[PDB]
């Protein structure tokens, strides 16, 4: 059931930031890494003394890499006077945010209607305001609100190219990379407490549950829009377990509540994995180890209706995770950690199903492809 | 004139570590940059809670990256008890580190014969002591002095395989990248005043001076070991000049004096040069603007005598400059700057002549490219 309770007008996940202590170097290896193109820049070369910003983008997904400069480039001005292109950027934020959690997500940055509006409703409903609504250009507003951790919920809307003060790269530096991913899926928080968690972002976005999760080692539930675009899952650790959760690790590796995994839905997942190995070893992303072969010898009996042998033949290959649901099928893998810590990970994901337009999170999430590659593992000793 | 008046028995460049946020992202971009093997690490896979240090080798070529763990995760170790494998590495001064100065070299480290000599002999002539000497295994000893700004001047040396604690990487995630890179031919470092920084490192080593030079912006000098195969040169700026010096746009970005370039020798710089500007756009590194095609028409007038004229049209087509002593030719381009800050960048070279064996410093540094570059581009303008 869809209770459709948005307290404000929400469109679609519009960017990612990542806070970084050099951009130009995250940004190169993610563009290499993921086959995203160099779309626009804030930096010295365009006035910005503040930060250095570096924007990629693939279909309609955004990664944004910010970095400071030296506060001695800046120290003569003032907010009302700032050449940052961000506003709500400060060096003290920013390299406390990455000495404490290292390489890491700050902004999950959502499109809304009006970003001020949405700023006013969420801290009227109990959001922990972060940044006020900033008008840039009295073209695009731009506020931040308190997620989990320290990331922070990014509400941007557009009266009428990505920021004022960002610049179109030049076509000699921007080669069109693509290896076939095209937007996000879902962005995921590590948290403590889920209970509180989903309280908190649930009563000032209105966002309703999507689904739920619970041995593996955590909780989970998944916050949705009203149409389902923009979907939030929270996962929380389970203790006791014999092997140790991996919520917990991520927790103590990167100094609390933090955003877990980011999924990147792609057009052809077979097309994105191909490209995406042959340069995990040459500066790209590397993926977690693959499933026996007895997972995919019980592939055949449960979505053999969907995907032909050969089809499945390649997933093998590729080491693709299949699961499915009553109304969608789902394909997803992972890479290991995108920087030095066990923290932060992308998910690569196709969703088959759910025509009406495709409706989101068609196929859930994976949950039955923890009981499947346990009972894949178990086949294997054989 | 050579006095030979080295304080100590100096062998080679031994490795160029870098202090980075995330050592992995750098490490990864540079790889595919430069062409370089990943060949050793210490990390948490390695028992390391302290830092992660990842190792690329082309030739002799050594680069370290190192980025530190939170420090919680080794909260209860002392230095006694600690994990990390290099016993000079410090949380706070690795923060501190890059938070002033952004990504940079942290350590130029030669091989010597004792490095507790070397550490003993250098303190007794003035060098300020940084990291004293400290026995690995009962293998390798390690010693640290500062060289200038937050830059230290490592010693090692080897009883009889980087350093203890570092493990080998697996063949399955070193993949063999070469682009013709072989080994360190010189660092130099950026200070404010140069004749203190040359009396006191001068002072210490007992290095002799190589070289100097001095409208260009700089006064500079190199130091030399007995056999020149070390060699340290250090600018200045020359304050006053219509043109800004880069040499104070350095210091400035910098947050003061460290080390301005890494020239990196090629046994082919041809070929070099052909591999890293494939990858300039697709995550590796960009070369400064080239010179106009005047400066290669004058080519011919001045090292006919070395390369043919179909060896100088290569030259053109990638950008190289030639610049030429009475006792060697070099060739040699330069690369933007390697991080988001204009500071830190690298050079490629090559050197013919001087065969005895070749001869340090052969072709000198290029000091001639000064005037022939601004001469070329009057004779554009034309
Ligand atoms: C034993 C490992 C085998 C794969 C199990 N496995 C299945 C899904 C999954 C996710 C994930 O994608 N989680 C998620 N995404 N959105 N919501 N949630 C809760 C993250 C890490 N391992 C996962
Ligand atoms: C106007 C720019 C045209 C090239 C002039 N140009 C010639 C050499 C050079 C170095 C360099 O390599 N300097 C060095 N290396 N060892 N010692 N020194 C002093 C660094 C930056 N620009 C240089
Ligand atoms: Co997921
Ligand atoms: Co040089």
Redesign the interface.
Same mark, same amino acid.
């Given at each position: 059931k869809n209770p459709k309770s948005d307290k404000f007008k929400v469109k679609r996940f519009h960017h990612i930031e990542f806070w970084?202590?050099?951009?130009?170097?995250?940004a190169?290896?993610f @563009?290499? *890494?993921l086959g995203m193109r160099?779309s626009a820049k804030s930096?010295?070369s365009t006035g910005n003394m503040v930060h250095?910003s570096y924007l990629l983008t693939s279909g309609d997904l955004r990664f944004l890499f910010t970095?400071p400069?030296?506060p001695?480039?800046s120290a003569g001005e003032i907010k009302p006077t700032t050449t940052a292109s961000i506003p709500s950027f400060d060096h003290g934020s920013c390299?406390s945010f990455?000495? @404490?959690h *290292?390489?890491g997500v700050r902004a999950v940055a959502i499109e809304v209607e009006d970003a001020e509006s949405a700023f006013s409703i969420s801290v009227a409903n109990g959001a922990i305001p972060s940044s006020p609504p900033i008008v840039l250009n009295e073209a695009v507003t731009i506020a931040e609100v308190k997620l989990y951790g320290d990331v922070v919920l990014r509400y941007v809307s557009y009266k009428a190219e990505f920021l004022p003060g960002f610049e179109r790269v030049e076509d000699?530096?921007?080669?069109p990379?693509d290896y076939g991913i095209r937007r996000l899926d879902h962005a995921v928080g590590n948290v403590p407490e889920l209970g509180p968690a989903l309280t908190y972002v649930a009563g000032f976005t209105g966002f309703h549950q999507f689904a739920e999760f619970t041995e593996s080692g955590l909780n989970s539930a998944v916050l949705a829009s009203n149409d389902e675009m923009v979907l939030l899952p929270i996962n929380e650790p389970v203790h006791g377990t014999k092997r140790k959760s991996q919520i917990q690790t991520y927790l103590?590796?990167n100094?609390g509540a933090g955003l877990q995994h980011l999924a990147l839905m792609s057009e052809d997942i077979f097309r994105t994995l191909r490209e995406m190995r042959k340069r995990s070893?040459?500066?790209?992303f590397?993926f977690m180890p693959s499933p026996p072969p007895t997972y995919y010898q019980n592939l055949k009996k449960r979505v053999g209706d969907v995907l032909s042998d050969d089809q499945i033949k390649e997933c093998e290959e590729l080491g693709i995770l299949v699961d499915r649901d009553d109304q969608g099928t789902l394909l997803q893998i992972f890479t290991k950690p995108?920087?030095?810590?066990?923290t932060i990970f992308i998910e690569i994901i196709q969703r088959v199903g759910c025509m009406m337009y495709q409706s989101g999170g068609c196929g859930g999430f994976g949950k039955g492809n923890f009981s499947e590659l346990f009972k894949s593992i178990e086949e294997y000793e054989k």
């Open positions: 970084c202590g050099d951009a130009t170097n995250v190169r290896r @563009s290499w *890494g160099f930096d010295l250095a970095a400069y030296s001695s480039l390299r990455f000495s @404490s *290292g390489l000699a530096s921007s080669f990379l103590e590796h100094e070893s040459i500066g790209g590397d995108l920087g030095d810590r066990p």
